């Protein structure tokens, strides 16, 4: 390793730093909340009718376990575009309170459903902010909801004063003033109704074939999680390096019973540099401290390879007792373990020394380790 890091075939006398060593995780745990209630996406989907865009609906889903896999059993999705989240990994996250906006609208303008898009849908009839983190789903609805005589349940706002803000509803039923002539009357020239019906003829082609559309605005914030994916909880493990997944907070470290009195509304135990120092178990209200694994640097003490071919190893800043636990088959970044617990492991204020014999004499410093400790190549 020293030859590799020096990029040479001959190393001189001295102490060299090569790499670091880290203890590796042994097992994994998963703890998801205490809920078994299914969420009713079928209510949004298997609906007799959809409210039109001019007054968009809104349903809140929370406090229920959800599985989007059953969503695949309903219909082929025309677009199914998830903007801020990976669609595949939607079953591994826990959220606060997802939303839902359902409506039937012509399928030739589906591209207008995006943050900062153009057209009437994105300007005068609806809008999404530049902070959308969710998904959009659509599927063909021309055949199911149409009329040979002309379906007129979809008068949509098309005139208004200024572009409506995202996540705001306007249901002002008034005759827009479209000219100089005063619009005090019911109707007339320069007094136009902003709402226009649709010619939902079943014989029309794909030019104006309406689709059903659902918009999910996932709520992502540091708050108690209500809706969650379909996973199974396990048993927590203490005093052992585990890959904990507490409510979706992936990490690695050892867990201990914490000693800080959380408040009832308190959830995390964050500290400087955005590290979740302490966290409370979702199943039973118990709090725990997270401590990172044992990590350190390694250095190779060698005489000149011209003279001999023996080396010693120094682990910087780790107690000697933790090394045998760290010593296993492929357990550290220096996967080699030839020394393991070898020749007279000696503990020094600088670190843990392997491969050297302490002596009760004194000479000049040949190769310096530190804290008043030096090493040398001597017989007996």
């Amino acid at each position: 390793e020293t030859k590799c890091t020096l990029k040479s075939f001959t190393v001189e006398k001295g102490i060299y730093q090569t790499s670091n060593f880290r203890v590796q995780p042994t097992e994994s745990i998963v703890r998801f909340p205490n809920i078994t209630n299914l969420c009713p996406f079928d209510e949004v989907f298997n609906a007799t009718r959809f409210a039109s865009v001019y007054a968009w609906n809104r349903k809140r889903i929370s406090n229920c376990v959800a599985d989007y896999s059953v969503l695949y059993n309903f219909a082929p999705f025309f677009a199914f575009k998830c903007y801020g989240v990976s669609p595949t990994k939607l079953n591994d996250l826990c959220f606060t309170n997802v939303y839902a906006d359902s409506f039937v609208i012509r399928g030739n303008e589906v591209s207008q459903i995006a943050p900062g898009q153009t057209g009437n849908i994105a300007d005068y009839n609806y809008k999404l902010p530049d902070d959308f983190t969710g998904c959009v789903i659509a599927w063909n609805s021309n055949k199911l909801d149409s009329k040979v005589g002309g379906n007129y349940n979809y008068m949509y706002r098309l005139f208004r004063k200024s572009n409506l803000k995202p996540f705001e509803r306007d249901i002002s039923t008034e005759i827009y003033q479209a000219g100089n002539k005063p619009c005090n009357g019911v109707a007339g020239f320069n007094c136009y109704f902003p709402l226009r019906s649709y010619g939902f003829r079943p014989t029309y082609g794909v030019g104006h074939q309406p689709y059903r559309v659902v918009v999910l605005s996932f709520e992502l914030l540091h708050a108690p999680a209500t809706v969650c994916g379909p996973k199974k909880s396990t048993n927590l493990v203490k005093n052992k390096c585990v890959n904990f997944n507490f409510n979706g907070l992936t990490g690695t470290g050892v867990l201990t019973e914490s000693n800080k009195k959380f408040l009832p509304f308190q959830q995390f135990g964050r500290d400087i540099a955005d590290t979740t120092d302490a966290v409370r178990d979702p199943q039973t209200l118990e709090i725990l401290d997270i401590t990172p694994c044992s990590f350190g640097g390694v250095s190779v003490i060698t005489p000149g390879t011209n003279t001999s071919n023996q080396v010693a190893v120094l682990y910087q800043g780790v107690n000697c007792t933790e090394v045998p636990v760290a010593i296993h088959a492929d357990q550290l970044t220096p996967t080699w373990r030839v020394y393991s617990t070898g020749s007279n492991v000696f503990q020094t204020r600088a670190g843990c020394l392997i491969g050297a014999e302490y002596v009760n004499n004194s000479y000049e410093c040949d190769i310096p380790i530190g804290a008043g400790i030096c090493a040398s190549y001597q017989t007996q």
Partner: protein, 273 residues
Amino acid sequence: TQSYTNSFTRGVYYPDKVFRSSVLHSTQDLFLPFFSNVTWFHAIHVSGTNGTKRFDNPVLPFNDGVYFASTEKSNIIRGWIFGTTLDSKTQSLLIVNNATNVVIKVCEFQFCNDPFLDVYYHKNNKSWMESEFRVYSSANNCTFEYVSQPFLMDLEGKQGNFKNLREFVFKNIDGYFKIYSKHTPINLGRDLPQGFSALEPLVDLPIGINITRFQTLLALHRSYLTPGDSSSGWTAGAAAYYVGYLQPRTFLLKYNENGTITDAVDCALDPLS
């Protein structure tokens, strides 16, 4: 009754859900500016024998949240109402708690009746309630019922001299309505003591409506130690009912070892600050 005073060090609350210990952390949120002035509104009960009007529920513009304080022994105020119109044309919200539970109902109310006031108003013998629930007449198509635990049960007062300060801060932001509460037991000598006490969060509710005005619901059936004075402007008196507004300011908070916000300093008040 119109009066002004100074809020020394009131209006500090936990910005979010997280634990910290012995940390001087800076935040930039909506807080009550330090050493600001708060208007005083007082109940007026004059000539209880006759039916002279009182009208102690004036409109308040509700500019970006409200801080409210009171020092009532009994639940003289039983709740609040919030709405841009407070009528059936738009949506309204009501928060009232009776002896058992609380009720929060964002609903389309045709019209809200006046707070319960009796013509006799015999506070000498009016220490009981009877038929004091018929409010807002009827309801309409509406949702989001939150019949749950009430806010205040009681803070028992013994030997007198123990007025219980109750402080509530209400804020509506990005579709959520949040209420933080704190009940300080000791009144000491001054009406508004100069101390430090954080406001632990109480409730967050996802309503998402339009609000530009609110009104207070008092138990006008019985009222004592609520006289009236004709002072208007920068005057003094007594209100037992304090309201103040919130501002987007930057604060620095000092979390002790136990995790309690012991002290805080403003960043736009004084050049020393």
